[PDB]
Design a protein around this ligand. Sequence first.
Ligand SMILES: *[C@@H]1O[C@H](CO[C@@H]2O[C@@H](C)[C@@H](O)[C@@H](O)[C@@H]2O)[C@@H](O[C@@H]2O[C@H](CO)[C@@H](O)[C@H](O)[C@H]2NC(C)=O)[C@H](O)[C@H]1NC(C)=O
Ligand SMILES: *[C@@H]1O[C@H](CO[C@@H]2O[C@@H](C)[C@@H](O)[C@@H](O)[C@@H]2O)[C@@H](O[C@@H]2O[C@H](CO)[C@@H](O)[C@H](O)[C@H]2NC(C)=O)[C@H](O)[C@H]1NC(C)=O
Lengths: 103, 103
Amino acid sequence: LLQYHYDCGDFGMQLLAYPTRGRTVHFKVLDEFGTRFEVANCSICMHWLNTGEDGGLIFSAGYEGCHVLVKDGRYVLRVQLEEMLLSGVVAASYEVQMTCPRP
Amino acid sequence: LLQYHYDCGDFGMQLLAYPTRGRTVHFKVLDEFGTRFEVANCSICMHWLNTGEDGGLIFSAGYEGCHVLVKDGRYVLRVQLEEMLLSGVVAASYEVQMTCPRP
Ligand SMILES: *[C@@H]1O[C@H](CO[C@@H]2O[C@@H](C)[C@@H](O)[C@@H](O)[C@@H]2O)[C@@H](O[C@@H]2O[C@H](CO)[C@@H](O)[C@H](O)[C@H]2NC(C)=O)[C@H](O)[C@H]1NC(C)=O
Ligand SMILES: *[C@@H]1O[C@H](CO[C@@H]2O[C@@H](C)[C@@H](O)[C@@H](O)[C@@H]2O)[C@@H](O[C@@H]2O[C@H](CO)[C@@H](O)[C@H](O)[C@H]2NC(C)=O)[C@H](O)[C@H]1NC(C)=O
């Protein structure tokens, strides 16, 4: 499987994913219509992509960033992870709802 | 003064500005509430910043990009240009409404 978890900060949250076997990870943000948006560095939307010292991918998003929605007094962002082979095919896809503050 | 003009393309438009005396140019996109957003490379919003061969700054924006509004069957994007000194102070500010297709 794919190792992932998310942390809640003061001004935003970050999602850390660890792919195996040389695979890569693509993050896609979802809106209320189910449309999928590729995640890239975006200062206007408060989206950022970085690699950790352990070799993991880190997607950090501000609470007031693009497509982060407010429901029941909590920040919620629906992100789908696509774990892919170097050929460009998707090996596995996971969907996670980042809800801050937890639970 | 500051030299600028915009061109209408098929899928988007680009704004070209030419600052003098070593000044720099900052592009800010405006929404309907008057809030000012700094323009940077943003694949999700279809905003891009590049420098031309003549040394000018080029801001290209897709017609379906962020804050591009539809009024009277035309794409309209309100952009404010800040011409600044290397000290960080604003020397001059111009506001332009990019309307495509012209007029
Ligand atoms: C995407 O952008 C990051 C920089 O984003 C920053 O960090 C966020 C938390 C945000 O709040 C701002 O502080 C910053 O804009 C790039 O990251 C750095 O990566 C370069 C390249 O390896 C490295 O030289 C820098 O030292 C890094 N910065 C820090 C503070 O360690 C990142 O490279 C960009 N990614 C792509 C693909 O363009
Ligand atoms: C910001 O991004 C551009 C690349 O954006 C591209 O062009 C747009 C029209 C878009 O539709 C896509 O095709 C692309 O993502 C960067 O530009 C290039 O700049 C580098 C650096 O000088 C150069 O090596 C490349 O050859 C350029 N690409 C081309 C096609 O000429 C630009 O550098 C980025 N700016 C910043 C500040 O990060």
